[PDB]
């Protein structure tokens, strides 16, 4: 039976966590995960989380909570270890949390309500393991997509935004950057504080502008779309900040945004329209540059787009130039 | 002015 199999595995990691918490109570030695064949149990649980029916059995047996607790406790016990076994364990746990959070309202809220785990998740963004960083950003991505108000507050309070922005300036692999930026894309929409935090990170704006012309030799637009989506979101705050505007000017942001108007990707066009909406508002200097770069002609043919953001964004930008 | 996406992948 699926259910007995899932129960077995869940009981295994609960009993291990119980051991770990008992050790923690002590201000009698430290338990070891290898000793309890914990990584294999998580591994199977991870594999099974790709299957809908097994996911369902997990949800009936509080699987999410159990896997989250394990991740939390291993993070608290060993910190930012480079040990292969504990990193593996954390990866598999995170992959399973990702699978169980996707599209699941109740699971997302449950995970965010687990404060200690949320703190552990965020701390893992400073792990030297890019694979682990990728997985954690995947969890944060799901938790931040269409979240309820309390979850949005929690995600902000545990320092997700600054940790993700710093992580983005640092990561070496395109695959890691992709999920880091995806999560930032979601989070940057949530509140104005998140936007300020992104803009506050030294070099963040230059970096974001750089993603607009990212040389994706993996033949995708993922980085352009994500980086530019973050930029669109924080652009509303950039608009009110002369120094930040200047950083954009120094990296030819406006010029590039105009070329994104010609992109075949509706996501890209949509992002650029939103960004131009904000940057073309109440700034003679940038309005003037936009006029001189031929923005009007590029924007007028987008006002009838079927995509609401492109239509409104381009129309609003056009009106900002015409006023 | 909106979010990106969610997913299953690893």
Short mmCIF file of C-alpha atoms in Angstrom, two decimals:
data_model
loop_
_atom_site.label_atom_id
_atom_site.label_comp_id
_atom_site.label_asym_id
_atom_site.label_seq_id
_atom_site.Cartn_x
_atom_site.Cartn_y
_atom_site.Cartn_z
CA UNK A 1 0.00 0.00 0.00
CA UNK A 2 1.09 3.55 -0.75
CA UNK A 3 -0.15 4.75 2.63
CA UNK A 4 1.74 2.18 4.74
CA UNK A 5 4.88 2.94 2.70
CA UNK A 6 4.52 6.69 3.24
CA UNK A 7 3.70 6.26 6.93
CA UNK A 8 6.78 4.05 7.42
CA UNK A 9 9.05 6.68 5.92
CA UNK A 10 7.39 9.56 7.86
CA UNK A 11 7.60 7.70 11.17
CA UNK A 12 11.31 7.13 10.44
CA UNK A 13 12.14 10.83 10.13
CA UNK A 14 9.86 11.82 13.05
CA UNK A 15 11.67 9.44 15.39
CA UNK A 16 14.98 10.85 14.22
CA UNK A 17 13.81 14.43 14.80
CA UNK A 18 12.62 13.36 18.25
CA UNK A 19 16.14 12.11 19.00
CA UNK A 20 17.60 15.37 17.69
CA UNK A 21 15.27 17.60 19.73
CA UNK A 22 16.06 15.52 22.84
CA UNK A 23 19.76 16.23 22.26
CA UNK A 24 18.98 19.95 21.77
CA UNK A 25 17.19 20.03 25.16
CA UNK A 26 20.59 19.34 26.74
CA UNK A 27 21.56 23.02 27.35
CA UNK A 28 24.74 12.73 26.37
CA UNK A 29 26.24 12.94 22.86
CA UNK A 30 25.07 14.08 19.44
CA UNK A 31 22.99 11.79 17.15
CA UNK A 32 24.18 11.22 13.59
CA UNK A 33 21.94 11.12 10.48
CA UNK A 34 24.07 8.45 8.74
CA UNK A 35 23.56 6.17 11.79
CA UNK A 36 19.80 6.21 11.21
CA UNK A 37 19.77 5.78 7.44
CA UNK A 38 18.00 9.07 7.24
CA UNK A 39 19.21 10.20 3.82
CA UNK A 40 17.78 7.11 2.05
CA UNK A 41 14.41 7.65 3.75
CA UNK A 42 14.31 11.29 2.60
CA UNK A 43 15.52 10.19 -0.83
CA UNK A 44 12.57 7.81 -1.35
CA UNK A 45 10.18 10.36 0.08
CA UNK A 46 11.57 12.86 -2.45
CA UNK A 47 11.13 10.50 -5.41
CA UNK A 48 7.58 9.71 -4.30
CA UNK A 49 6.74 13.46 -4.02
CA UNK A 50 6.85 13.63 -7.85
CA UNK A 51 3.78 11.35 -7.92
CA UNK A 52 0.34 12.91 -7.25
CA UNK A 53 -1.15 9.89 -5.47
CA UNK A 54 1.83 9.60 -3.10
CA UNK A 55 1.71 13.38 -2.49
CA UNK A 56 -1.91 12.91 -1.45
CA UNK A 57 -0.97 10.19 1.08
CA UNK A 58 1.75 12.50 2.43
CA UNK A 59 -0.82 15.31 2.92
CA UNK A 60 -3.14 12.95 4.83
CA UNK A 61 -0.25 12.09 7.16
CA UNK A 62 1.31 15.56 7.75
CA UNK A 63 4.27 14.78 5.50
CA UNK A 64 5.09 18.41 4.76
CA UNK A 65 5.48 19.27 8.43
CA UNK A 66 7.64 16.16 9.02
CA UNK A 67 10.03 16.81 6.11
CA UNK A 68 10.27 20.49 7.06
CA UNK A 69 11.17 19.63 10.68
CA UNK A 70 13.96 17.33 9.50
CA UNK A 71 15.45 20.02 7.28
CA UNK A 72 15.20 22.53 10.11
CA UNK A 73 16.84 20.30 12.71
CA UNK A 74 19.77 19.22 10.45
CA UNK A 75 20.37 22.89 9.61
CA UNK A 76 20.36 23.84 13.30
CA UNK A 77 22.64 20.94 14.28
CA UNK A 78 25.34 21.28 11.60
CA UNK A 79 25.00 24.84 10.27
CA UNK A 80 26.57 25.64 6.91
CA UNK A 81 28.49 22.37 6.68
CA UNK A 82 30.17 21.28 3.47
CA UNK A 83 29.56 17.64 4.47
CA UNK A 84 28.19 15.76 1.47
CA UNK A 85 25.72 13.64 3.42
CA UNK A 86 23.99 16.54 5.21
CA UNK A 87 23.88 18.63 2.02
CA UNK A 88 22.35 15.69 0.12
CA UNK A 89 19.79 15.25 2.88
CA UNK A 90 18.87 18.95 2.73
CA UNK A 91 18.58 18.91 -1.06
CA UNK A 92 16.16 15.96 -1.04
CA UNK A 93 14.08 17.42 1.76
CA UNK A 94 13.88 20.74 -0.13
CA UNK A 95 12.99 19.03 -3.42
CA UNK A 96 10.10 17.31 -1.62
CA UNK A 97 8.92 20.56 0.01
CA UNK A 98 8.95 22.12 -3.43
CA UNK A 99 6.80 19.32 -4.86
CA UNK A 100 4.37 19.47 -1.92
CA UNK A 101 4.04 23.27 -1.94
CA UNK A 102 3.32 23.60 -5.69
CA UNK A 103 -0.25 24.79 -6.20
CA UNK A 104 -1.08 23.82 -2.61
CA UNK A 105 -2.54 26.66 -0.56
CA UNK A 106 -2.64 24.77 2.74
CA UNK A 107 0.92 23.43 2.46
CA UNK A 108 2.41 26.86 1.62
CA UNK A 109 0.70 28.43 4.64
CA UNK A 110 1.71 25.52 6.88
CA UNK A 111 5.39 25.82 5.92
CA UNK A 112 5.47 29.63 6.39
CA UNK A 113 3.89 29.21 9.81
CA UNK A 114 6.91 27.14 10.84
CA UNK A 115 9.15 30.03 11.85
CA UNK A 116 12.28 28.11 12.80
CA UNK A 117 12.23 26.21 9.52
CA UNK A 118 11.68 29.42 7.47
CA UNK A 119 14.76 30.85 9.22
CA UNK A 120 16.72 27.67 8.36
CA UNK A 121 15.62 27.77 4.71
CA UNK A 122 16.85 31.37 4.40
CA UNK A 123 20.18 30.66 6.13
CA UNK A 124 20.80 27.89 3.53
CA UNK A 125 21.03 30.56 0.80
CA UNK A 126 24.57 31.12 2.13
CA UNK A 127 25.46 27.45 1.60
CA UNK A 128 28.47 26.84 -0.71
CA UNK A 129 26.40 24.11 -2.39
CA UNK A 130 24.82 25.67 -5.49
CA UNK A 131 22.54 22.68 -5.84
CA UNK A 132 21.27 23.31 -2.32
CA UNK A 133 20.89 27.03 -3.06
CA UNK A 134 18.86 26.11 -6.16
CA UNK A 135 16.51 23.85 -4.20
CA UNK A 136 15.93 26.38 -1.39
CA UNK A 137 15.17 29.13 -3.89
CA UNK A 138 12.67 26.70 -5.46
CA UNK A 139 10.89 26.36 -2.12
CA UNK A 140 10.91 30.14 -1.58
CA UNK A 141 9.64 30.62 -5.16
CA UNK A 142 6.58 28.44 -4.49
CA UNK A 143 5.94 29.95 -1.06
CA UNK A 144 5.99 33.45 -2.54
CA UNK A 145 3.72 32.79 -5.53
CA UNK A 146 0.11 33.86 -4.75
CA UNK A 147 0.70 33.77 -0.99
CA UNK A 148 -1.73 34.89 1.71
CA UNK A 149 -0.96 38.01 3.75
CA UNK A 150 0.56 36.34 6.83
CA UNK A 151 2.91 34.18 4.71
CA UNK A 152 3.97 37.31 2.78
CA UNK A 153 4.77 39.01 6.10
CA UNK A 154 6.68 35.93 7.38
CA UNK A 155 8.73 35.64 4.13
CA UNK A 156 9.76 39.27 4.60
CA UNK A 157 10.48 39.01 8.34
CA UNK A 158 12.89 36.04 8.01
CA UNK A 159 14.99 38.15 5.58
CA UNK A 160 14.24 36.24 2.34
CA UNK A 161 14.63 39.24 0.06
CA UNK A 162 18.03 40.47 1.05
CA UNK A 163 19.33 36.90 1.24
CA UNK A 164 18.05 36.17 -2.30
CA UNK A 165 19.40 39.40 -3.78
CA UNK A 166 22.85 38.77 -2.24
CA UNK A 167 22.71 35.15 -3.37
CA UNK A 168 21.99 36.43 -6.93
CA UNK A 169 25.15 38.59 -6.98
CA UNK A 170 27.15 35.59 -5.93
CA UNK A 171 25.94 32.35 -7.59
CA UNK A 172 28.03 30.92 -10.45
CA UNK A 173 25.62 28.57 -12.28
CA UNK A 174 22.84 29.72 -14.56
CA UNK A 175 20.55 27.04 -13.08
CA UNK A 176 20.98 28.42 -9.56
CA UNK A 177 20.49 32.00 -10.72
CA UNK A 178 17.28 31.03 -12.52
CA UNK A 179 15.48 29.87 -9.36
CA UNK A 180 17.01 32.59 -7.15
CA UNK A 181 15.63 35.21 -9.59
CA UNK A 182 12.28 33.45 -9.87
CA UNK A 183 11.77 33.73 -6.12
CA UNK A 184 12.88 37.35 -6.14
CA UNK A 185 10.45 38.03 -8.98
CA UNK A 186 7.57 36.80 -6.81
CA UNK A 187 8.79 38.46 -3.60
CA UNK A 188 9.54 41.84 -5.21
CA UNK A 189 5.79 42.29 -5.91
CA UNK A 190 4.64 41.73 -2.28
CA UNK A 191 5.27 45.08 -0.59
CA UNK A 192 7.28 48.28 -0.94
CA UNK A 193 9.75 47.20 1.80
CA UNK A 194 10.89 44.22 -0.27
CA UNK A 195 11.55 46.58 -3.19
CA UNK A 196 13.57 48.95 -0.98
CA UNK A 197 15.64 46.02 0.32
CA UNK A 198 16.48 44.89 -3.21
CA UNK A 199 17.42 48.44 -4.20
CA UNK A 200 19.50 48.79 -0.99
CA UNK A 201 21.85 45.85 -1.83
CA UNK A 202 25.10 47.31 -3.22
CA UNK A 203 25.29 46.53 -6.95
CA UNK A 204 21.77 45.05 -7.20
CA UNK A 205 20.45 47.59 -9.73
CA UNK A 206 23.47 47.35 -12.03
CA UNK A 207 23.11 43.60 -11.83
CA UNK A 208 19.36 43.72 -12.70
CA UNK A 209 20.00 45.95 -15.70
CA UNK A 210 22.72 43.47 -16.77
CA UNK A 211 20.17 40.62 -16.85
CA UNK A 212 18.20 42.52 -19.52
CA UNK A 213 21.02 41.75 -22.01
CA UNK A 214 22.12 38.46 -20.47
CA UNK A 215 23.93 36.18 -22.94
CA UNK A 216 21.93 32.98 -22.40
CA UNK A 217 23.94 30.44 -24.42
CA UNK A 218 21.60 27.83 -22.88
CA UNK A 219 19.17 29.22 -25.50
CA UNK A 220 16.43 30.44 -23.09
CA UNK A 221 14.98 33.78 -22.01
CA UNK A 222 14.51 32.69 -18.40
CA UNK A 223 17.10 35.14 -16.97
CA UNK A 224 15.95 38.08 -19.08
CA UNK A 225 12.35 37.41 -18.05
CA UNK A 226 13.08 37.00 -14.32
CA UNK A 227 15.65 39.80 -13.95
CA UNK A 228 13.44 42.13 -15.96
CA UNK A 229 10.38 41.12 -13.93
CA UNK A 230 12.21 42.04 -10.73
CA UNK A 231 13.34 45.28 -12.37
CA UNK A 232 9.75 46.08 -13.41
CA UNK A 233 8.58 45.50 -9.87
CA UNK A 234 11.24 47.67 -8.17
CA UNK A 235 11.02 50.27 -10.94
CA UNK A 236 8.10 51.98 -9.13
CA UNK A 237 10.53 52.84 -6.30
CA UNK A 238 13.46 53.54 -8.62
CA UNK A 239 11.28 56.18 -10.29
CA UNK A 240 11.31 58.20 -7.03
CA UNK A 241 15.08 57.97 -6.61
CA UNK A 242 17.43 60.12 -8.68
CA UNK A 243 20.57 58.18 -7.71
CA UNK A 244 18.89 54.90 -8.65
CA UNK A 245 17.69 56.38 -11.96
CA UNK A 246 21.28 57.46 -12.60
CA UNK A 247 22.59 53.92 -12.02
CA UNK A 248 20.07 52.81 -14.67
CA UNK A 249 21.20 55.57 -17.05
CA UNK A 250 24.85 54.56 -16.55
CA UNK A 251 23.92 51.06 -17.70
CA UNK A 252 21.76 52.18 -20.68
CA UNK A 253 18.58 50.75 -19.18
CA UNK A 254 16.18 52.87 -21.22
CA UNK A 255 17.86 51.96 -24.57
CA UNK A 256 17.64 48.26 -23.71
CA UNK A 257 14.02 48.52 -22.53
CA UNK A 258 13.11 50.00 -25.92
CA UNK A 259 14.67 46.99 -27.72
CA UNK A 260 12.72 44.64 -25.38
CA UNK A 261 9.59 46.22 -26.87
CA UNK A 262 10.54 44.33 -30.07
CA UNK A 263 10.94 40.96 -28.30
CA UNK A 264 8.88 37.94 -29.32
CA UNK A 265 8.44 37.04 -25.66
CA UNK A 266 5.28 38.63 -24.30
CA UNK A 267 6.75 38.31 -20.79
CA UNK A 268 9.73 40.46 -21.80
CA UNK A 269 7.55 43.04 -23.58
CA UNK A 270 5.23 43.13 -20.58
CA UNK A 271 8.11 43.65 -18.12
CA UNK A 272 9.61 46.46 -20.25
CA UNK A 273 6.23 48.24 -20.60
CA UNK A 274 5.77 48.23 -16.83
CA UNK A 275 9.31 49.53 -16.30
CA UNK A 276 8.82 52.27 -18.94
CA UNK A 277 5.49 53.13 -17.36
CA UNK A 278 7.28 54.02 -14.11
CA UNK A 279 10.48 55.55 -15.53
CA UNK A 280 8.59 57.74 -18.03
CA UNK A 281 6.48 59.24 -15.23
CA UNK A 282 7.30 62.64 -13.76
CA UNK A 283 10.90 62.82 -14.97
CA UNK A 284 11.68 65.36 -17.75
CA UNK A 285 15.21 63.98 -18.27
CA UNK A 286 14.21 60.38 -18.94
CA UNK A 287 11.08 61.44 -20.84
CA UNK A 288 13.39 63.50 -23.07
CA UNK A 289 15.83 60.60 -23.64
CA UNK A 290 12.87 58.34 -24.47
CA UNK A 291 11.54 60.86 -26.98
CA UNK A 292 14.96 61.14 -28.63
CA UNK A 293 15.39 57.34 -28.80
CA UNK A 294 12.09 57.06 -30.71
CA UNK A 295 10.00 55.49 -27.91
CA UNK A 296 6.72 56.92 -29.21
CA UNK A 297 6.76 54.83 -32.44
CA UNK A 298 7.77 51.69 -30.54
CA UNK A 299 5.05 52.14 -27.91
CA UNK A 300 2.06 53.18 -30.09
CA UNK A 301 1.83 49.77 -31.79
CA UNK A 302 1.46 47.98 -28.44
CA UNK A 303 -1.59 49.78 -27.06
CA UNK A 304 -3.97 47.29 -28.67
CA UNK A 305 -2.12 44.17 -27.48
CA UNK A 306 -4.39 41.42 -26.10
CA UNK A 307 -2.12 41.18 -23.01
CA UNK A 308 -3.58 43.70 -20.50
CA UNK A 309 -0.21 44.69 -18.93
CA UNK A 310 1.32 45.48 -22.38
CA UNK A 311 -1.72 47.47 -23.52
CA UNK A 312 -2.03 49.54 -20.33
CA UNK A 313 1.70 49.86 -19.67
CA UNK A 314 2.52 50.99 -23.19
CA UNK A 315 -0.52 53.29 -23.21
CA UNK A 316 0.42 54.85 -19.86
CA UNK A 317 4.05 55.30 -20.93
CA UNK A 318 2.91 56.90 -24.19
CA UNK A 319 0.64 59.30 -22.25
CA UNK A 320 3.52 60.18 -19.91
CA UNK A 321 5.53 61.26 -22.95
CA UNK A 322 2.58 63.14 -24.55
CA UNK A 323 1.55 65.15 -21.46
CA UNK B 1 3.16 44.76 -11.77
CA UNK B 2 2.89 41.11 -10.66
CA UNK B 3 4.71 37.91 -9.66
CA UNK B 4 6.56 35.36 -11.87
CA UNK B 5 5.66 31.67 -11.39
CA UNK B 6 5.72 28.50 -9.24
CA UNK B 7 6.86 24.93 -10.14
CA UNK B 8 7.61 21.25 -9.36
CA UNK B 9 11.13 20.82 -10.82
CA UNK B 10 13.72 19.61 -8.26
#
